[PDB]
Amino acid sequence: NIESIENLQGIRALQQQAPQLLSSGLPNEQQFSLLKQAGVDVVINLMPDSSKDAHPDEGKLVTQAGMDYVYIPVDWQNPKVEDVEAFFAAMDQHKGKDVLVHCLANYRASAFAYLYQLKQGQNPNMAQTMTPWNDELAIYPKWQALLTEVSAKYGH
Ligand SMILES: [Cl-]
């Protein structure tokens, strides 16, 4: 219900990308319970566990809160097409479920959400979807290259 959803607005860099897809930064432990209460079914974590900011065992927190957990860590300095494909496969395996894809500050996740919507034929607006990037995509040519390569691969 709407109250549980407005109840997600304290999650860092949270942005609803579609009625069944949320993207965000890193939920704290209590926020995973809020996610469950809002109806989220699956959490897809793109943040490497090696980050000093990461939970020691995010999957424990996610599964304890009653949700399914997928871990696809994405290296900031060398994001791979294979990472994007792995995300796309995870989305297909959770067809019809409410999903959160996240990282620390929603850069990786909003980029991956854009590519997903683009390949699904949903014609996303890039700037809108990637609001957390605060127009910094040009700063990061490896990310630019990833986005261009995947867009071209899947018809766009
Ligand atoms: Cl915490």
Distance between CA 146 and CA 101 in Å, rounded? 18
- Method of determination? X-ray
Cα–ligand 1 centroid distance for 29 (angstroms): 4
Residue 132 has which token pair?
A: 């957390």
Phi, psi of 42 (to 5 degrees): -135, 140
Resolution (A): 1.4
3-state secondary structure of 40: coil
Distance between CA 156 and CA 148 in Å, rounded? 9
Of 127, 126, 106, 104, whose CA–CA distance to 116 is shortest? 126
- What domains appear along the chain, each with residue ranges and CATH number? 1-156 (3.90.190.10)
Ligand 1 is an ion; residues with CB less than 5 A from it: 28-29
Of 100, 115, 113, 121, whose CA–CA distance to 148 is shortest? 115
Run of H or E residues at 69: strand 68-71
Of 52, 2, 63, whose CA–CA distance to 29 is shortest? 63
Cα–ligand 1 centroid distance for 148 (angstroms): 35
